[PDB]
Amino acid sequence: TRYRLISATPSPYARKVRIALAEKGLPFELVTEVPWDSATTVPRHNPLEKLPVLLLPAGGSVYESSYILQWLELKHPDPPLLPPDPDGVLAARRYEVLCDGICDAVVLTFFERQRDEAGRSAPWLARQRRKIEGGLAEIARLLGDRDWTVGDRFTLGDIAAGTVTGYLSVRFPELDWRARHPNLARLSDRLEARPSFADSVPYAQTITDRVV
Amino acid sequence: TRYRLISATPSPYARKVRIALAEKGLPFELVTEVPWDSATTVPRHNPLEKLPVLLLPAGGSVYESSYILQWLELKHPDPPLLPPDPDGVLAARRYEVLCDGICDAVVLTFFERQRDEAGRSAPWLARQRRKIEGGLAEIARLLGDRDWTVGDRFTLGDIAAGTVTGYLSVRFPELDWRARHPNLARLSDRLEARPSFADSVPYAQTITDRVV
Ligand SMILES: N[C@@H](CCC(=O)N[C@@H](CS(=O)(=O)O)C(=O)NCC(=O)O)C(=O)O
Numbered sequence: 001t002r003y004r005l006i007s008a009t010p011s012p013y014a015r016k017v018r019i020a021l022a023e024k025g026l027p028f029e030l031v032t033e034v035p036w037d038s039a040t041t042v043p044r045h046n047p048l049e050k051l052p053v054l055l056l057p058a059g060g061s062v063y064e065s066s067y068i069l070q071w072l073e074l075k076h077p078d079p080p081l082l083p084p085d086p087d088g089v090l091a092a093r094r095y096e097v098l099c100d101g102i103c104d105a106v107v108l109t110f111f112e113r114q115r116d117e118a119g120r121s122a123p124w125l126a127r128q129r130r131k132i133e134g135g136l137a138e139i140a141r142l143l144g145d146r147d148w149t150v151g152d153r154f155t156l157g158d159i160a161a162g163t164v165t166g167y168l169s170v171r172f173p174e175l176d177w178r179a180r181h182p183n184l185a186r187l188s189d190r191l192e193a194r195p196s197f198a199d200s201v202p203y204a205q206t207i208t209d210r211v212v
Numbered sequence: 213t214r215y216r217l218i219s220a221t222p223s224p225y226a227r228k229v230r231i232a233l234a235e236k237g238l239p240f241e242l243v244t245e246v247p248w249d250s251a252t253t254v255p256r257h258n259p260l261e262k263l264p265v266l267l268l269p270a271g272g273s274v275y276e277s278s279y280i281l282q283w284l285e286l287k288h289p290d291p292p293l294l295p296p297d298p299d300g301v302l303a304a305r306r307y308e309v310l311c312d313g314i315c316d317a318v319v320l321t322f323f324e325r326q327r328d329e330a331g332r333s334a335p336w337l338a339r340q341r342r343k344i345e346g347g348l349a350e351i352a353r354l355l356g357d358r359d360w361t362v363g364d365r366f367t368l369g370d371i372a373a374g375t376v377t378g379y380l381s382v383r384f385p386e387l388d389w390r391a392r393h394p395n396l397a398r399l400s401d402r403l404e405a406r407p408s409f410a411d412s413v414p415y416a417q418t419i420t421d422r423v424v
Pocket residue numbers: 008010011012013014035036048049050051052063064065066100107339
């Protein structure tokens with residue numbers, strides 16, 4: 001069994017999936033696209049026209065990163081990325097909710113800042129910034145002084161925490177997350193040494209087409 | 213056991229939760245707010261500053277509608293809103309992914325249309341519209357000629373399909389979904405007669421504060 005994954009170089013949503021595939025020992029081909037350019041092939045698979053898209057070997061696709069991760073956990077349960085118990089499942093998923101919500105607000109911010117300056121909405125930017133900073137502070141609070149986000153070993157919660165912090169350094173660089181949250185700095189440094197992370201570090205892509 | 217739910221009258225995300233609580237026979241108090249006004253209390257509970265927020269009786273909260281639904285399924289498994297088998301779980305969740313993605317694009321459209329006309333982005337509007345119409349067409353395709361979205365009985369898939377269609381009639385009224393997708397029209401008519409739906413129909417709220 002092998003997969004193909006439509007991905008973009010900065011994409012945190014795709015990074016979660018890339019990390020999960022590697023952690024589960026599932027081979028895959030990375031199919032890099034700019035999903036904001038008219039050349040993207042995402043609409044052929046995802047009615048929502050977003051990546052990541054997991055392309056299945058016998059045909060069809062799975063989209064929406066959190067859903068792809070649930071799909072992978074059911075199809076390939078070993079090694080697990082979630083704890084076996086419901087409380088642990090829910091704890092890991094809460095980190096993922098926060099990661100995703102922060103990332104959504106970062107993307108909305110990025111595209112607001114692509115508008116002509118005169119047309120940028122200060123209240124919309126401020127609204128999204130409260131989500132970014134407040135969501136991040138909550139991830140840091142939940143981690144506290146512990147070695148792992150959930151329990152005693154690597155889980156989805158660590159995928160989420162490491163992904164969002166790595167993404168902020170690319171697409172919300174003004175926020176000194178390492179200084180405000182040294183616990184996240186230390187966790188990030190541990191996680192970024194894992195091969196799954198080291199093979200998926202974000203960088204900024206080039207967007208050519210007009211989006212806004 | 214009883215809950216309080218911070219909700220807004222049009223909110224499809226909150227509607228899914230309101231339907232689920234009622235279908236599971238879980239009493240709750242509806243706490244209606246406009247989450248776009250400065251009076252909202254959502255930030256006291258959700259770092260992402262969104263509703264729905266499920267307020268727990270002994271303290272704390274759960275946010276993000278899909279996560280709230282997963283939480284409810286674990287805490288209150290009977291009666292179930294998901295099939296017992298993994299294929300059925302994944303099928304129901306795919307409808308929820310589509311519902312949520314359509315709703316996200318509707319909200320972005322609504323707020324773009326609140327901008328001064330000269331500042332509205334035609335390409336951004338067009339991008340979101342492809343998600344709305346294409347996502348809806350996929351829900352209709354998946355339902356096909358069957359009585360229920362998933363298997364032989366009411367599930368989360370029906371919550372998703374009925375919620376998104378009811379919401380489009382309020383916040384994307386130009387789209388004649390009943391005419392293009394008579395299967396969804398018929399399903400909607402069945403679902404809207406259920407007490408859980410009939411007690412949660414969306415209507416437009418008043419937004420006073422500037423959002424964009
Ligand atoms: N909720 C989705 C979000 C995915 C998403 O927004 N992807 C972006 C790319 S990236 O920001 O991750 O770089 C996309 O394809 N956007 C295209 C669009 O929204 O039209 C998920 O979790 O997969």
